[model samples]
Target chain A: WVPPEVFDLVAEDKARCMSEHGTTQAQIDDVDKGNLVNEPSITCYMYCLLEAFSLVDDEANVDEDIMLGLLPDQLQERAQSVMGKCLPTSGSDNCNKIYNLAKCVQESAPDVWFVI
Target chain B: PDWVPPEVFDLVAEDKARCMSEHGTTQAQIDDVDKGNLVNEPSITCYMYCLLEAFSLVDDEANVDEDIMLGLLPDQLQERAQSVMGKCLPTSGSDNCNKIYNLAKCVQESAPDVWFVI
Candidate 1:
């Protein structure tokens, strides 16, 4: 018999972020397919999830080192290079900062940027 | 009614503390505004300015950023916020603090229930 399924950290984080930001499944699906929007419901959801994972600070500053550490060795340099172009995030607000970061990452390295 | 989510509450609380100190605001002044007994005092009005700015509801010139502000409301309030803002926006007064004071009064007068203290 197959072993029982266990708790999923990714699912738990996604659920909480979606609720907090009022993000719909359609929004995440579009993001998964690399179609990003500037809507706060989706952008702020990304900020929320990054916060939940301790990848960003309260002020929305991305921790570049920590992020690179989480990626596979094969993709680490690619992400690092992309982030080098996108580091020192900026926008009018916290969520917008993440939106800018995501757009920058997508423009440079589409294969490395995705949301679920 | 203490209905806000804990993280949201905590988020606002952090801003409240800093805004209060920066504006020389007392809990009593904030309490007064909470109960709708507002007066044009820097301790109260400037605190209001500081808080709204922290939330990005207003810009450097105290003009309301309607798009960002509307996105932060509840479903029912979303429509109302938009309508009232159309009538009450472009926050203006003699000063930045007084600007928020005027804006708050306009909001309260336009949508009595939506201009909550939190």
Candidate 2:
């Protein structure tokens, strides 16, 4: 299949990463779990997620402290204070995690593509 | 009702874990998801797929028959689900992994509707 190159690389690792943790993914509401599973949610979720996440993506105005309120203290302990990265347009490390991870997958695993 | 699915927790946790295990923090990647630029993080589609898959598993696993689900779900949403799954497969390998996960999150936070089709 004419899979997107970037998709082939990063998606495989992402699948592995998610699988490693044993995520309980629900089949797309439109199809059975074992049906044409990949078609329904993959692309839409990507678009919507990007849209929702964009709110905190590259904004340089959001305050880390303010954003920390969005995350539980336990999460705060592990991830950066986030408050420090505050920028409504681009200060969220949560958004960055996906970005950096994608970069790594893009560079490291460009051959294996994930299906499901 | 024991309708609350474990898949919900799985999606959130997986997304969270994936983020945690890897960089877990970067302005660049966040921008891509937020911007809908899966170009940077192609797996975003897969992450989203993971999310919806978990949701479907729960509904199907719940012993809810196809007819019952069709009755309860909103028509628009059902259609969206179908669209999401239909549009995402790749030839060699399928994985649209990325940061955007709202579509998946929606299924997780809310219970499956009877009317939903996927």
Candidate 3:
């Protein structure tokens, strides 16, 4: 039981994220339709969004419990099933880690990479 | 005691979709819960947990983040809310969802104004 307004920014955060990285909607849409790639521009934006939500921490480690906590209830079982395989996420850098995460998740169920 | 900024509703609209879809909780359940018809099943309970965690109102372990919490409430109700929170928190139950269930019931019992927002 609590008051509201903690999640006061989906639009605001996304705008700041894109503005921060100069990520274009066209590129975002391309990934949403499942063209998972290793591009830094898009991947860094993705990492930025995840980080803003605290789904991933600094140094870009995915917090599986927190990630699962935010997922819809129906997909949690599946998300966890896939999640177990994909984390402790490894990559050369922060953006690369999110890129690897995007690809790894898409490999199991293509829809798993949808922008939140 | 339980209202939000405009953008919070927008965020909830999306999180509600994802959280309900994943949990098997329906819009009807949340609406009813919103109106004070509390149901203790995991579907509804876990969905509440999901919504709370989605916004960081509660942590992954279901412990309420009291500092952030006090900041979100209206100033008029802060002391009452804080008092009840002190009584009911450090959330505890058999599991994460149940922890929220207990916390919800506990908060409402002492201070009627406290609400579970999405």
If scored against the real structure, what TM-score would every candidate get? 0.51, 0.23, 0.56
Off by over 4 Å in 3: A1-8, A111-113, B1-14, B18-50, B59-62, B66-118
Q: Residue by residue across A1-116, what tens digits does model 2's lDDT show?
A: 22111222223333443343343345323211212222313323322233232212333233344333233335555325222332233213443433433233223323321122
TM-score of 3: 0.56
lDDT of 1 by residue, A1-116 (tens): 22222223356567778999899999987776667789999999999877765568888998776566444345667878888899889998889998899778777764443443
Recovered native contacts, candidate 2: 0.00
lDDT of 3 by residue, A1-116 (tens): 54332223455566777888889999887765667688888999989888877678888998777677666556789989888888888899999999998777777664334456
The C-alpha RMSD in Å for every predicted model, in order, reads: 15.7, 20.8, 9.8
Model 3 Cα displacement at A25 (Å)? 1.9
Off by over 4 Å in 2: A1-116, B1-18, B23-28, B40-75, B90-118
Candidate 2 has an lDDT of 0.32
lDDT of 1 by residue, B20-94 (tens): 888788888887776666799998998887766654567668877786565445444667778888988788799
What's the best-to-worst order under lDDT? 3, 1, 2
Worst 10 residues of 3 chain B by lDDT: B1-10
